[PDB]
Amino acid sequence: NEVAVSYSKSLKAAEMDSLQLPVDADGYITIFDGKTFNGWRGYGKDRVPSKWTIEDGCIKFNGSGGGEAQDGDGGDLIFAHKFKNFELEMEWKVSKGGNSGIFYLAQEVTSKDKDGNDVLEPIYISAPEYQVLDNDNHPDAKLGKDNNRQSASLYDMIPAVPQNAKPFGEWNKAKIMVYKGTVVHGQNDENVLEYHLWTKQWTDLLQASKFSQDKWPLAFELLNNCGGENHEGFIGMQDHGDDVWFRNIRVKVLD
């Protein structure tokens, strides 16, 4: 009925503690219990930012409208267990004109500035993103190429086809499967895209994106070898300054 799941407590720390989490007959582990943030923490932090709350059995982000600014007590949220071959399923609801995202294979990455100080880099320069978006009112829906910044897209690389999202304020179902390099995105019980990590196709997608070797050398390096040496990393959700809700979050380990 339950499985032990290790988790880390702070930036780049080892997974030295474990939670007993429910698992169903098909192997899905419920990683959000509807009541606590146990195992969850802010990306780069040792605590859950206070703009993330629990309401009506959902993880809620309380956004102030600043986009990428991540002002206030915000920042992205991760479940602090590295997964490798997994299938994640969760429900998401976005506010009108809102933007968030579901990250996977994420690494906590710092760089050094010219004086040797640390700089925490964005989660999205190591983590592929399943976009979360109000496709009718957020301008990102019209940017990019072939609708590849609309909901359930692999952000700036592969559009969701079919684009079957429900409108803002409605619950959508997300699926992200990563299995030995094969990745599938699902939206509302349909597979909307499929790709293969660490291939020539993967490099070509990156080189056509905002993360190309020319535009963002660090991002290209991280994403081209997605997941680092061990090809694993965190699932998480995006602070993009907008109200968004997530619930019924469960993960099946596939090997």
Ligand X SMILES: O=C1[C@@H](O)[C@@H](O)O[C@H](CO)[C@H]1O
Instruction: Assess 101 for contact with Ca ion (CB under 5 A).
Output: yes
Instruction: Assess 95 for contact with its own copies (CB under 8 A).
Output: no
Report in angstroms how near the CB of residue 237 gets to its own copies at its nearest.
17
Nearer residue to ligand X within complex by CB, 39 or 75: 75
Contacting ligand X (CB under 6 A), which of 76, 87, 108, 140? 140
Instruction: Assess 129 for contact with ligand X (CB under 6 A).
Output: yes
- Residue with tokens 């993330």, as numbered in its chain: 52
Structure tokens at 22: 């429910």
Contacting ligand X (CB under 6 A), which of 155, 202, 220, 246? 155
Structure tokens at 244: 């968004």
Instruction: Assess 218 for contact with its own copies (CB under 8 A).
Output: no
Report in angstroms how near the CB of residue 41 gets to its own copies at its nearest.
21
Report in angstroms how near the CB of residue 64 gets to Ca ion at its nearest.
16
Residues between 24 and 43 that touch its own copies (CB under 8 A): none
Coil/strand/helix, residue 230: coil
Coil/strand/helix, residue 40: strand
Instruction: Assess 208 for contact with its own copies (CB under 8 A).
Output: no
Structure tokens at 51: 């703009």
Contacting its own copies (CB under 8 A), which of 66, 166, 248, 253? 66
Cα-flanking dihedrals φ and ψ of residue 230, to 5°?
-95, 5
Rounded (10°) angle between helices 200-207 and 217-224: 160
Report in angstroms how near the CB of residue 101 gets to ligand X at its nearest.
5
- Taking CB under 8 A as the binding criterion, the range among 20-28, 126-134, 152-160, 192-200 that sits at the site for its own copies is 192-200
C-beta neighbour count of 27 within 10 angstroms: 13
Nearer residue to ligand X within complex by CB, 88 or 183: 183
**H or E element in which residue 78 lies:** strand 77-83
Instruction: Assess 180 for contact with its own copies (CB under 8 A).
Output: yes
With CB under 5 to 8 Å by kind, the binding choice for 172 among Ca ion, ligand X, its own copies, none is none
Instruction: Assess 67 for contact with its own copies (CB under 8 A).
Output: yes
208: which residues sit within 8 A by CB, 6+ positions away?
A: 157
Q: Is 103 exposed, middle or buried (0-12, 13-18, 19+ CB in 10 A)?
A: buried
| Residue 181, CB-side half-sphere exposure with 13 Å CA sphere | 9
Q: Is 243 exposed, middle or buried (0-12, 13-18, 19+ CB in 10 A)?
A: middle
With CB under 5 to 8 Å by kind, the binding choice for 119 among ligand X, its own copies, Ca ion, none is its own copies
Q: In the bound complex, which residue of the shown chain has the CB atom lying closest to ligand X?
A: 124
